[PDB]
Every structure is written in structure tokens, then in C-alpha cells.
Amino acid sequence: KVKMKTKSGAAKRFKRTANGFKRKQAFKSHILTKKSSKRIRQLRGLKMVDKSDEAAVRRMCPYI
Template identity: 75%
Template sequence: MPKIKSHSGAAKRFKRTASGSFKRGQSHRSHILTKKSTKRKRQL
């Protein structure tokens, strides 16, 4: 059987650390942030 492919969406979102666990970025924090207050961004 052929090798199973990685889930391409997950591959872009998660990074594997040296110890084998995974890191991910917080959602809702990428763009359109200038109009939002610091408090509002912090609570996302």
C-alpha cells in the first residue's frame, strides 16, 4: 500500500517541536486588527 498523505490543511497550521508535541497559532489574530481595541484583541 502507498504511504498515507499528510492532511495538507493541518500541515500548514501545526508545527512539530523537537520533543514531538505540536504548536499552533491562535485563531482570529491575523488581520483587520487596527480598528479593534487592545482589550478586544487580548480577549480573542
């Protein structure tokens, strides 16, 4: 039967936590010599998805 489809590229970017979604940060893939060690430190790891982006993330990933 027909079902809602997940946006698979968004499911590759967002994961379910208890009260929201987690994600990695941008600006860490390349050209990193010029960036300060503070930015390299702090752009590492997870952030939460912003509450303004949360409805879009729920629309894109309706099963995770």
C-alpha cells in the same frame, strides 16, 4: 507503493515540538483596531495544541 497521505493544510498549521505540537493563534488576521492592546499582544506567538486536539493532529499529520 500506497502510503498514508498527510493532510497538507494541517501540516501548514501545526509543527512538531519535543512533547507536542505548536500553532499560531486565531483572531489576529484583520479587524484589529477594535481589539485591546492586551489581546493583540497575547494573541501573538505560539500556543500548544490542546491534548484533546492532539490525537486529531496526529491522525492528520502522521509523518512530521
